[PDB]
């Protein structure tokens, strides 16, 4: 199961030992798995509404809100645990020569288990509160490379 840490992982506020049943109640009530919509026109993946993973940094089932800048880029590194490096490619204008030069920036981003990603896939990231020393973004959508 998802219980792989030393502590028991669960969603905060979802009581799992209630005598009554959760049939007919909203998410997060009656022991039902909690999930939410982040707004801005983004859809909640089926893997997050019907999954069993526990991720307090997940934008759909965790305790983090999306607000600020929405960016897009390509998955550059997917070797960390639930974190990827997103490469953003842009052109910098060199004024004196009236021409452009290619630049890039690597943006660390948290990716919830509901998303599948590989190097080269296109990802959309939304800003959230600091999740670690460098992570300030959460993956909101993944488009497989060549699609």
């Amino acid at each position: 199961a998802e219980q792989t840490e030393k502590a028991f992982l669960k969603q905060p506020g979802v009581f799992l030992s209630s005598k009554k049943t959760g049939k007919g109640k909203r998410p997060g009530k009656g022991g039902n798995r909690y999930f939410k919509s982040i707004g801005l026109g983004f859809k909640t993946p089926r893997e997050a509404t019907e999954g069993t993973y526990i991720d307090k940094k997940c934008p759909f089932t965790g305790n983090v809100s999306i607000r600020g800048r929405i960016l897009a880029g390509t998955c550059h590194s997917a070797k960390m645990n639930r974190t990827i490096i997103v490469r953003r490619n842009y052109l910098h204008y060199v004024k004196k020569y009236q021409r452009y030069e290619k630049r890039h920036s690597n943006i660390p981003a948290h990716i919830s288990p509901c998303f599948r990603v590989k190097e080269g896939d296109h990802v959309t990231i939304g800003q959230c509160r600091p999740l670690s020393k460098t992570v300030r973004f959460n993956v909101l959508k993944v488009i497989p490379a060549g699609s």
Partner: protein, 141 residues
Amino acid sequence: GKTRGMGAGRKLKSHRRRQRWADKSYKKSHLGNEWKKPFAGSSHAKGIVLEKIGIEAKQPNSAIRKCARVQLIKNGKKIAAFVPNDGCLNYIEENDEVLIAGFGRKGHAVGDIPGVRFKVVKVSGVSLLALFKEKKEKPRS
């Protein structure tokens, strides 16, 4: 020929960066060797007259240019300062405080005076021009 691409902004900027060093005027200001000059980037400097000397004028001229070896007070470097005008060397005594200036060509030698790039402006706090024209007199005796 020149790189022309719209996306060639980096190469053009970096190429010029490297090539500006080939310009002698650019390299003289950005090398940092100006601080090692006796004036160390200053316009003037005070010093102590070590001795009164004469320098043979360069050819095809023939004369004895009256100069003075000066040790700069702020860094202790010794330089040769030309003393201009007729008979102004008589106004200079050894172990005397003199204000020195450049010779006008930004550290280059001037005229037929070999290897001289400085001139004397003041002596004992008085300008040589005032002494030459008998406006003022040196403060002593």
